[PDB]
């Protein structure tokens, strides 16, 4: 029960933290 | 000296509106889902539908014996006239209130919104609902509020058939930064002659009976039974 990388990326793909949310989602996927 | 019936039929709905509000603020975290009043001339019965039946009466029944005594003082019942009973909702997944309160105790406990809402839609659809919609509004990302909407299946919006084919619930959840609104709509299946769903079919659905296949005779035969 932590944070969801999918939701994080979908909500912050165009903000300042896009480069970090992409990295976290890639870590979750692979 | 008694009262007019215009005022009597009204006063019986104001009484039932405040009792539901009082029980809502009291047994919500225990699965409260509705109340029913049966005015028997000897003993007024009040049935409370809930999920966790053990958390309503409590150990030794020390909680529903408190409710039946705090209710009669408020509403001026004579002692022993009013009795409160607790029962179980037949199906929890198709009650909008029980799902709009279940999702409130997941947003109040640290679940992500996106996964809290899919866990509710999945349980709603797996219980036999025909459609579901869950909306969450408020400050989910920063100082600006926004709405997330999760839909699944069929959902009707207009007409009279909406007054019995859908169940709606609106609830508030108080977080550290503000208030989030949770709306849950469930569209029930048909279930002819059934507890769940309306027995009436949808007003636009036409059911045509498939004829029984028969062989038309070629030659004449009399049957002299």
């Amino acid at each position: 029960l932590g944070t969801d990388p999918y939701e994080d990326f979908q909500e912050n793909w165009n903000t300042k933290h896009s480069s970090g949310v992409t990295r976290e989602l890639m870590r979750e996927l692979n | 000296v008694q009262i007019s019936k215009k005022r009597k039929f009204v006063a019986d709905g104001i009484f039932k509106a405040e009792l539901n509000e009082f029980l809502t603020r009291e047994l919500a975290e225990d699965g409260y889902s509705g109340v029913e009043v049966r005015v028997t001339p000897t003993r007024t019965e009040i049935i409370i539908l809930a999920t966790r039946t053990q958390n309503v009466l409590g150990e030794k029944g020390r909680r529903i014996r408190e409710l039946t005594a705090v209710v009669q003082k408020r509403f001026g019942f004579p002692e022993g006239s009013v009795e409160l009973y607790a029962e179980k909702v037949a199906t929890r997944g198709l009650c909008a209130i029980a799902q709009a309160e279940s999702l409130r105790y997941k947003l109040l406990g640290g679940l992500a919104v996106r996964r809290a809402c899919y866990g509710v839609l999945r349980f709603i659809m797996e219980s036999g609902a025909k459609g579901c919609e869950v909306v969450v509004s408020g400050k989910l990302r920063g100082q600006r509020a926004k709405s997330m909407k999760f839909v699944d299946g069929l959902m009707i919006h207009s007409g009279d058939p909406v007054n019995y084919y859908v169940d709606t619930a609106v609830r508030h959840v108080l977080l550290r930064q503000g208030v989030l609104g949770i709306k849950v709509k469930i569209m029930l299946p048909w279930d002819p002659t059934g507890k769940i769903g309306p027995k009436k079919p949808l007003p636009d659905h036409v059911s045509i009976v498939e004829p029984k296949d028969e062989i038309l005779p070629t030659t004449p035969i009399s049957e002299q039974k």
Binding site: - | F22, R25, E26, R62, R65, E66, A69, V70, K73, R74
Partner: protein
């Protein structure tokens, strides 16, 4: 708050496990405490005190307070009123 009023309020809540009042500070008499001349304000401000110590739990709805005794309230009012230990509130005696 006269000591007689304070005693009257405390030993009425003891028989039950519950208390009901209306949020009306100008009502001159509490209906359950008639013939003792105990105003409605005194009941409100006594249950305010007993709640802050943790001995009761409240619920408010539609201008009404509904208070319940907690296990620490029976233990505390038994010594305040010097009641025999063979006294138990009406909530605790059934089933």
């Amino acid at each position: 708050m006269p000591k007689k009023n304070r005693i009257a309020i405390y030993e009425l809540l003891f028989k039950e496990g519950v208390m009901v009042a209306k949020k009306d500070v100008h009502m001159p008499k509490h209906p359950e405490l008639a013939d003792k001349n105990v105003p409605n304000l005194h009941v409100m401000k006594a249950m305010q005190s007993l709640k802050s110590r943790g001995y009761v739990k409240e619920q408010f709805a539609w201008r009404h307070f509904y208070w319940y005794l907690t296990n620490e309230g029976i233990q505390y009012l038994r010594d305040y009123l010097h009641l025999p230990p063979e006294i138990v509130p009406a909530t605790l005696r059934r089933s």
